[PDB]
Write a protein that binds this ligand. Structure first.
Ligand SMILES: [Mg+2]
Length: 127
RNA sequence: UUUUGUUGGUUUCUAGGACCAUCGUAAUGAUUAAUAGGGACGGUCGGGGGCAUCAGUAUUCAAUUGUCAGAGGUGAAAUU
Protein backbone atom coordinates (compact mmCIF):
# COMPACT_ATOMS: atom_id res chain seq x y z
CA UNK A 1 0.00 0.00 0.00
CA UNK A 2 2.59 2.56 1.15
CA UNK A 3 4.75 3.81 -1.74
CA UNK A 4 8.16 4.65 -0.28
CA UNK A 5 11.13 6.95 -0.77
CA UNK A 6 14.46 7.79 0.85
CA UNK A 7 14.41 11.38 2.14
CA UNK A 8 18.16 12.20 2.25
CA UNK A 9 18.68 15.37 4.28
CA UNK A 10 22.20 16.70 3.64
CA UNK A 11 22.30 19.08 6.60
CA UNK A 12 25.65 20.86 6.42
CA UNK A 13 26.43 24.16 8.08
CA UNK A 14 25.54 27.01 5.68
CA UNK A 15 22.94 24.96 3.68
CA UNK A 16 20.46 22.06 3.89
CA UNK A 17 19.27 19.69 1.16
CA UNK A 18 16.18 17.52 1.03
CA UNK A 19 16.77 14.98 -1.75
CA UNK A 20 13.92 12.44 -1.98
CA UNK A 21 14.79 9.30 -4.00
CA UNK A 22 13.68 5.78 -4.92
CA UNK A 23 15.01 2.80 -2.91
CA UNK A 24 17.79 1.97 -5.39
CA UNK A 25 18.81 5.64 -5.22
CA UNK A 26 19.26 6.37 -8.95
CA UNK A 27 15.88 7.93 -9.87
CA UNK A 28 15.19 11.08 -7.81
CA UNK A 29 11.93 12.90 -6.97
CA UNK A 30 12.87 16.33 -5.57
CA UNK A 31 16.26 17.84 -4.63
CA UNK A 32 14.97 20.94 -2.83
CA UNK A 33 17.59 23.01 -0.99
CA UNK A 34 17.74 25.76 1.64
CA UNK A 35 19.27 28.48 -0.54
CA UNK A 36 16.68 27.78 -3.25
CA UNK A 37 13.67 28.86 -1.12
CA UNK A 38 15.28 31.89 0.62
CA UNK A 39 17.43 34.27 -1.46
CA UNK A 40 19.52 35.83 1.32
CA UNK A 41 22.95 34.01 1.13
CA UNK A 42 23.06 33.95 4.97
CA UNK A 43 19.63 32.31 5.32
CA UNK A 44 20.38 28.91 3.71
CA UNK A 45 20.98 26.56 6.66
CA UNK A 46 18.53 28.77 8.60
CA UNK A 47 15.58 26.66 9.85
CA UNK A 48 12.69 28.45 8.14
CA UNK A 49 14.32 28.04 4.73
CA UNK A 50 14.96 24.36 5.43
CA UNK A 51 11.33 23.89 6.46
CA UNK A 52 10.17 25.57 3.25
CA UNK A 53 12.42 23.30 1.20
CA UNK A 54 11.03 20.25 2.98
CA UNK A 55 7.48 21.40 2.28
CA UNK A 56 8.32 21.88 -1.39
CA UNK A 57 9.81 18.38 -1.53
CA UNK A 58 6.68 16.94 0.08
CA UNK A 59 4.51 18.74 -2.47
CA UNK A 60 6.62 17.36 -5.31
CA UNK A 61 6.31 13.85 -3.88
CA UNK A 62 2.54 14.24 -3.65
CA UNK A 63 2.40 15.41 -7.27
CA UNK A 64 4.45 12.41 -8.35
CA UNK A 65 2.67 9.73 -6.28
CA UNK A 66 4.61 8.70 -3.08
CA UNK A 67 3.28 8.11 0.50
CA UNK A 68 6.21 7.40 2.88
CA UNK A 69 9.95 8.09 3.30
CA UNK A 70 13.05 6.70 4.96
CA UNK A 71 14.97 9.54 6.62
CA UNK A 72 18.69 9.44 5.95
CA UNK A 73 20.66 12.36 7.38
CA UNK A 74 24.10 13.42 6.14
CA UNK A 75 26.26 15.94 7.98
CA UNK A 76 29.02 17.42 5.77
CA UNK A 77 31.35 14.59 6.78
CA UNK A 78 35.01 13.55 6.65
CA UNK A 79 37.08 16.73 6.46
CA UNK A 80 34.23 18.85 7.91
CA UNK A 81 32.04 18.93 11.07
CA UNK A 82 30.46 15.43 11.33
CA UNK A 83 27.75 17.42 13.15
CA UNK A 84 24.17 17.59 11.76
CA UNK A 85 23.36 21.17 10.73
CA UNK A 86 20.88 23.66 12.21
CA UNK A 87 18.15 22.77 9.69
CA UNK A 88 18.15 18.97 9.44
CA UNK A 89 15.88 18.69 12.47
CA UNK A 90 13.74 21.55 11.19
CA UNK A 91 13.45 19.86 7.79
CA UNK A 92 12.40 16.61 9.47
CA UNK A 93 9.76 18.47 11.48
CA UNK A 94 8.44 20.09 8.31
CA UNK A 95 8.25 16.70 6.60
CA UNK A 96 6.34 15.28 9.56
CA UNK A 97 3.91 18.19 9.46
CA UNK A 98 3.37 17.64 5.73
CA UNK A 99 1.96 14.15 6.50
CA UNK A 100 4.29 12.35 4.10
CA UNK A 101 4.79 9.24 6.26
CA UNK A 102 8.07 8.22 7.93
CA UNK A 103 9.84 4.87 8.46
CA UNK A 104 13.41 3.83 9.44
CA UNK A 105 15.42 6.99 10.30
CA UNK A 106 19.25 6.94 10.07
CA UNK A 107 22.28 9.23 10.09
CA UNK A 108 24.54 8.04 7.25
CA UNK A 109 27.18 10.76 7.71
CA UNK A 110 30.41 9.46 6.16
CA UNK A 111 32.41 9.28 9.40
CA UNK A 112 35.74 7.92 8.19
CA UNK A 113 38.22 5.52 9.47
CA UNK A 114 41.06 7.99 9.84
CA UNK A 115 40.50 10.96 7.51
CA UNK A 116 42.87 12.44 4.97
CA UNK A 117 44.18 15.79 6.37
CA UNK A 118 41.53 18.22 7.71
CA UNK A 119 41.01 22.02 7.38
CA UNK A 120 43.01 24.89 8.89
CA UNK A 121 46.64 23.78 9.04
CA UNK A 122 48.32 22.89 12.33
CA UNK A 123 47.58 26.20 14.11
CA UNK A 124 43.96 25.90 12.91
CA UNK A 125 41.40 28.54 11.98
CA UNK A 126 42.07 31.75 13.88
CA UNK A 127 39.17 34.26 13.85
C1' U B 1 138.96 -25.36 47.42
C1' U B 2 141.50 -28.46 50.39
C1' U B 3 145.33 -31.69 51.18
C1' U B 4 148.41 -35.79 47.64
C1' G B 5 156.38 -31.59 47.04
C1' U B 6 154.80 -27.67 42.89
C1' U B 7 152.96 -26.82 37.86
C1' G B 8 149.49 -29.22 33.58
C1' G B 9 145.74 -32.87 33.91
C1' U B 10 142.08 -37.12 34.85
C1' U B 11 138.86 -39.20 38.44
C1' U B 12 137.59 -39.26 43.38
C1' C B 13 136.00 -38.52 48.45
C1' U B 14 133.29 -34.60 49.35
C1' A B 15 130.59 -29.79 50.38
C1' G B 16 127.58 -25.84 47.71
C1' G B 17 124.74 -24.57 42.92
C1' A B 18 121.07 -25.83 39.44
C1' C B 19 117.66 -29.52 36.80
C1' C B 20 114.32 -33.96 35.41
C1' A B 21 112.77 -38.82 38.39
C1' U B 22 110.33 -41.53 41.95
C1' C B 23 109.18 -42.44 47.52
C1' G B 24 107.01 -40.29 51.41
C1' U B 25 104.67 -36.23 54.52
C1' A B 26 100.29 -33.18 55.30
C1' A B 27 93.30 -31.93 56.75
C1' U B 28 97.70 -31.51 50.63
C1' G B 29 95.56 -26.67 47.30
C1' A B 30 89.33 -23.09 44.60
C1' U B 31 86.27 -17.97 50.47
C1' U B 32 81.60 -15.98 49.49
C1' A B 33 78.27 -17.03 45.34
C1' A B 34 76.96 -9.50 46.65
C1' U B 35 68.14 -8.44 46.82
C1' A B 36 76.34 -6.66 42.03
C1' G B 37 76.85 -7.95 36.82
C1' G B 38 76.94 -11.03 32.55
C1' G B 39 75.20 -15.53 30.03
C1' A B 40 71.79 -20.35 29.36
C1' C B 41 66.99 -22.03 30.53
C1' G B 42 61.33 -21.39 31.23
C1' G B 43 56.56 -19.49 30.23
C1' U B 44 55.08 -14.79 28.96
C1' C B 45 54.25 -9.60 27.56
C1' G B 46 54.19 -5.50 24.49
C1' G B 47 50.61 1.00 19.76
C1' G B 48 59.02 -1.54 20.57
C1' G B 49 62.06 -1.89 15.40
C1' G B 50 62.74 -3.99 9.90
C1' C B 51 60.50 -6.30 5.78
C1' A B 52 55.13 -8.03 3.83
C1' U B 53 49.89 -7.52 3.22
C1' C B 54 44.59 -6.12 4.64
C1' A B 55 40.89 -2.94 5.77
C1' G B 56 37.93 1.70 6.64
C1' U B 57 38.26 4.17 3.41
C1' A B 58 38.18 9.14 2.93
C1' U B 59 38.88 12.61 0.13
C1' U B 60 39.88 14.09 -5.66
C1' C B 61 39.76 13.71 -10.76
C1' A B 62 37.61 10.90 -14.33
C1' A B 63 34.00 7.35 -16.41
C1' U B 64 28.81 5.75 -16.88
C1' U B 65 24.11 7.17 -13.82
C1' G B 66 20.16 10.27 -12.69
C1' U B 67 17.44 14.64 -11.76
C1' C B 68 16.90 21.70 -14.27
C1' A B 69 18.66 26.89 -10.29
C1' G B 70 21.79 27.76 -8.17
C1' A B 71 25.58 24.95 -4.96
C1' G B 72 30.61 26.68 -2.46
C1' G B 73 32.11 29.88 1.36
C1' U B 74 31.22 33.21 5.63
C1' G B 75 32.76 35.70 11.87
C1' A B 76 29.40 38.43 12.28
C1' A B 77 29.04 39.59 6.73
C1' A B 78 30.31 39.52 1.93
C1' U B 79 33.46 37.88 -2.72
C1' U B 80 34.13 33.51 -5.09
MG1 LIG C 1 42.09 19.77 -6.70
Amino acid sequence: SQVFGVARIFASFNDTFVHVTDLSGRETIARVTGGMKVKADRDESSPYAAMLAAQDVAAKCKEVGITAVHIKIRATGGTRSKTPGPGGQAALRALARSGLRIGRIEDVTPVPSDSTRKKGGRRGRRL
